[PDB]
């Protein structure tokens with residue numbers, strides 16, 4: 001089972017923190033979005049476009065649950081996985097690091113050409129605020145450590161992580 005599960009909105013640093021925390025802990029990183037693409041042979045965008053979000057969430061839940069059982073390193077969950085009650089259930093007992101980010105920073109960090117079915121223009125900031133407002137309690141409900149990625153150098157936030165995993169609380 002994972003040493004740590006990372007959750008948070010798109011732009012919260014899951015891929016990069018993932019990478020640094022994993023190196024620090026000395027194991028592999030698995031991103032459940034990547035795992036979904038590997039298992040299905042499909043892009044996430046095609047699943048959303050052609051089959052819809054609800055089908056995506058069921059697939060995702062299955063993959064997340066498998067990963068929680070079979071992966072031994074750092075696991076990063078796609079931003080919306082926590083909207084699935086079964087995903088929340090499966091996370092019980094695990095170490096769950098919530099990467100918290102404000103809307104301004106998250107919006108800036110997600111504005112390139114990455115395809116994002118649930119975060120595409122116009123009014124991307126409005127869409128980001130809506131995801132944040134809805135998902136905030138869900139992230140909080142599952143997390144065991146929360147770290148602020150707004151301003152600290154990643155390498156830093158991670159220190160809050162390696163150190164924090166190690167001592168009581």
Ligand SMILES: O=C(O)C1=C[C@@H](O)[C@@H](O)[C@H](O)C1
Pocket residue numbers: 010033044077078079080081116117118
């Ligand atoms: O915020 C979301 O719900 C998503 C985030 C991505 O990681 C992908 O899992 C997908 O585009 C859905």
Ligand SMILES: [Cl-]
Pocket residue numbers: 018019020022023029
């Ligand atoms: Cl790594």
Ligand SMILES: [Cl-]
Pocket residue numbers: 056057058059060061080081082083084087
């Ligand atoms: Cl899901």
Ligand SMILES: [Mg+2]
Pocket residue numbers: 016019
């Ligand atoms: Mg990096």
Ligand SMILES: [Mg+2]
Pocket residue numbers: 037042043044045
């Ligand atoms: Mg894709």
Ligand SMILES: [Mg+2]
Pocket residue numbers: 055058059
């Ligand atoms: Mg299916």
